[PDB]
Design a protein around this ligand. Structure first.
Ligand SMILES: Nc1ncnc2c1ncn2[C@@H]1O[C@H](COP(=O)(O)OP(=O)(O)O)[C@@H](O)[C@H]1O
Ligand SMILES: Nc1ncnc2c1ncn2[C@@H]1O[C@H](COP(=O)(O)OP(=O)(O)O)[C@@H](O)[C@H]1O
Ligand SMILES: Nc1ncnc2c1ncn2[C@@H]1O[C@H](COP(=O)(O)OP(=O)(O)O)[C@@H](O)[C@H]1O
Lengths: 55, 375, 375, 375
């Protein structure tokens, strides 16, 4: 029972790990997009400042 | 994987290589001109690995590689590495063999002649291309930008050429070439980042510095005033993420690097900068040419993407130029990619379909033919 | 007993030796790496009594024997005792004469050369092995763990070498060897148990303590808090049965023993512990390597079976490591055996059959051949 | 003790501290850049014992101390420890309180800027020195050496700057900073002495290896010939007496340590060595300035005391140079102390008196004054 609970808890952890791992992949991909969007934004904003200077 | 035997176009320089099919509006393969080699002894068995890594492989596995470029200030000195870069770019990424297509390669007008002699030879002898044409980069810039007339200031990775063209003709006596380039700007930045406490001495580190420059640096319209502020306040610093999770913040170094293009003395070069060479090329052209060249200062190549550069160039040139005269900067979105775009435009012209050296004219004459047929 | 002339694998360290055949999952037999010798004349009838004992006989009869290990802090100096240990494991449990099978032995890259050379000499001259191969324990651990990249912290019985590998390549400038190992943790425990009223001095007392350590001790994720309670209450003590029926209990001293891996000053060592060496091997590598090694701290050797050791190693490194990048401990239930398993994996690779020193090469070159072919 | 308010001169590197007064031709005393601290719990009462020891005190009582270096790769990171080293140097050996005398400190130009600001700041704010001057280390070797032209290769304990100087001018675009220095050579020796069966890891042991290197190692004019014999015969081994009466002998490892200066891959560095950087410093200078630098490869600092180092540097550069010119190594007796000696020369020049930062100027401007007044 400790072993079944262990395999199960290991799976609670493995599944929780699969889920956090899925989430870690999502944070890495989304946060990378956050930063790319933020960088694209910084770019758009820097371009905006120049576009406004151009305006 | 294309269904037509169009000419292939490939702007392969000292930095990056851009390639695609003639007639399109963008390169399809954009890779570094790099062949990487391990600087470590393999320890584990059955690890795969390469003898050498090419293009994106070279940067992807760079943590243990020394990375070399085959092209030095515009000239190929290592054509074995070029064959691998071209093979990868053409066969693996563009999905085409030159064997079934004419190919267009590019070079500055005063690029040493051996450069054209080898680009022609490798495509005819190792890739069996049916035809070849080495193009002038300034020509391609003018086609890409919608011009026949202007000064092409090509700010390259290894060299700045600077050539005036009027009505499609070169004015070669007015070429003002400088040993001032994007690669020197990178070297300058790492020395000043060392001053800040962040030393970069290995290839992986060199690559980081080039990445910092490309994402964080700018010129703005007035350097000395921008530096007076950046040197006085933290509000001008920008953070960059280093590969190991650590960060570097960069202050006035953010612009001192790009500024070398206007102040070459920053890297020990005996030059007045890119705006003065643009001006001198106009100045040495005939008086009835000058007005059209002042109205058309044409950007080509990279570094043209620094915030404030199109405007910095117009400002610095109008400051040297005479009054009454109109000084304009041509700084199209086809920046850094304008040589490739021009290659596509030139290759697709009906007036250019008789210009490639055939695999017959080449076989009879040898590679010296490039100077009889291309430029 | 064995169907094929596969390589034999013998991870013979300063504590235990793991012997079996390549291609399998586990050693066929595990013996202490010892030869025992009596310091007493037997009195009773039916007590055996040998001039010398090997392996499990030496441990079983240890009450009147001094037990010597052939290995001092990672190297075999007692080549006569390693011949008995090898003969016993090979012929009595594996049921093999090495003459008919290749043999794989282990060490680390900064381990003194005498070890790989004497091991090679004995297997070829005493056992007539047809081939030999001395492997790196870090290499074997990464194969067992499903890695090509990572830090292998071989927390052995007499030494920790700590060897970083990236993409299958050695990074030798970053190897950080420590005179910190499981045998020292046992010695700490003997001294602290003496303070508790249970003195241990002789070999048979240094072993029982070794058993106490393996069953009662743990690392403790948080030392100070665990100690504040363990040093204050019997509810944190565990009981051990001594050979004469006496009972010893251990409180905060239970963790004090393994704590030496995190606080080597406990045994008079000028070191901050196994996580400092792990941290530095990663830090001494290039920045495009660092992030992959942080995410792959790989366990090898024993002491890894400590309730809290993996929990603590990941905590200790993430606390030192840069943010953003992942820090991970790779601590599979294949602890203490990750090298043997790796031995089997390497020995059985088809590409590894080109790595062997053959008997003919040995007879021509002598034992120095191991340095031409291994690593 | 001192009859004039001359400048005090001190070279505080990652290795040694050289100190004397301006006007002499040698430092009066040499101390290691070390602050030592007990790593043991005192047992006897009334034993005195300092909280910290400095310089020679730190080495003399090192048996129970851990010894730390406040300077890394040329930069002071621990100013508190340097204040203690400086106080000892100034008050106990030079017998001068800085308040009554100017002080000259020095650094290589690519040393992160924080170092020159702190050297200036500590001397003005904790010692109240009436004046300060942070000098260029490369320059000081040239003054001591009798030259205004040459490549100054200041390979020290933690880093090499390597700067070409012509007619008293720097050529800053041709500086080759490299992470190769005497401290790495020591680390390389510790790894290869471990291979021989002599592991050195603790402070006492690390200091022994630095002493072994300094007395037993050599470069070897011909690396291949020396390892072929040294690795094959005891006739090329040299004995060193260890502090406890035991001995160590070293064979080809004797030259493999300094070999790293020519072979940086031994310590994990992506470099071709000190002669490649010397060559490149020359090559990146103007055509009319490379014919004077070839004839003047100038040594600076230590790691230059090797039995063959000057012999090999001349050979390696002449082998790279396009003949024609003389290639010469300038390797004066003022070795390892040419930087200190130059400091004496510079501090005392009549043409340098206006270069001193006075305390009043410092107090008005703050620590940044070093960039307005020194270099
Ligand atoms: N954001 C940027 N900042 C600075 N330089 C840039 C930037 N974008 C592009 N460049 C430069 O573009 C160069 C490569 O483009 P390119 O001029 O087309 O090579 P080539 O003309 O010789 O074939 C590189 O030196 C790169 O640093
Ligand atoms: N539960 C445990 N608690 C404490 N230490 C352990 C435990 N299991 C294994 N070790 C230690 O690790 C060593 C055995 O594993 P191993 O390292 O593979 O043998 P070797 O060091 O000879 O290669 C012994 O010193 C043993 O005490
Ligand atoms: N005989 C020698 N053998 C090896 N190295 C030496 C010898 N003599 C001096 N050095 C090295 O010189 C270094 C310190 O010299 P120094 O150049 O004055 O430091 P710095 O100029 O950077 O302030 C030390 O690492 C020392 O080991």
């Amino acid at each position: 029972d400790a072993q079944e609970k262990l395999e199960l808890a290991e799976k609670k952890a493995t599944d929780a790990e699969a889920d956090v791992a899925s989430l870690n992949r999502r944070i890495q991909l989304v946060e990378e997009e956050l930063d790319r969007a933020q960088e694209r934004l910084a770019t758009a904003l820097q371009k905006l400042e120049e576009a406004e200077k151009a305006a | 994987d294309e269904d037509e035997t169009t000419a292939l176009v490939c702007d392969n320089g000292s930095g990056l290589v851009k390639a695609g099919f003639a007639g399109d509006d963008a390169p399809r393969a954009v890779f570094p001109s790099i062949v990487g080699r391990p600087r470590h002894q393999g320890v584990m068995v059955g690890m795969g690995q390469k003898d050498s890594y090419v293009g994106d492989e070279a940067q992807s596995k760079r943590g243990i590689l020394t990375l070399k470029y085959p092209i030095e200030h515009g000239i190929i000195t290592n054509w074995d590495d070029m064959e691998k870069i071209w093979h990868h770019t053409f066969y693996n990424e563009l999905r085409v063999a030159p064997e079934e297509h004419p190919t267009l390669l590019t070079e500055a007008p005063l690029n040493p002649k051996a450069n054209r002699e080898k680009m022609t030879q490798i495509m005819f002898e190792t890739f069996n291309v049916p035809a070849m044409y080495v193009a002038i980069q300034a020509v391609l810039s003018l086609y890409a930008s919608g011009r026949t007339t202007g000064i092409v200031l090509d700010s390259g990775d290894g060299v700045t050429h600077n050539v005036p063209i009027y009505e499609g003709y070169a004015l070669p006596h007015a070429i003002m070439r400088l040993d001032l380039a994007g690669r020197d700007l990178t070297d300058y930045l790492m020395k000043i980042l060392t001053e800040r406490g962040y030393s970069f001495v290995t290839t992986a580190e060199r690559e980081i510095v080039r990445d910092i420059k490309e994402k964080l640096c700018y010129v703005a319209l007035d350097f000395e005033n921008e530096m007076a502020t950046a040197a006085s306040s933290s509000s001008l610093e920008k953070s960059y993420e280093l590969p190991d999770g650590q960060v570097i913040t960069i202050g006035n170094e953010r612009f001192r690097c790009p500024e070398t293009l206007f102040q070459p003395s920053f890297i020990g070069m005996e030059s007045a900068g890119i705006h003065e060479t643009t001006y001198n090329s106009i100045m040495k052209c005939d008086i009835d040419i000058r007005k059209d060249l002042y109205a058309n200062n044409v950007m080509s190549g990279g570094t043209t993407m620094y915030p404030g550069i199109a405007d910095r160039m117009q400002k610095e040139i109008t400051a040297l130029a005479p009054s009454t005269m109109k000084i304009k900067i041509i700084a199209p979105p086809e920046r850094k990619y304008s040589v490739w775009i021009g290659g596509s435009i030139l290759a697709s012209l009906s007036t250019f379909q008789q210009m490639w050296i055939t695999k017959q004219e080449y076989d009879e004459a040898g590679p010296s033919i490039v100077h009889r047929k291309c430029f």
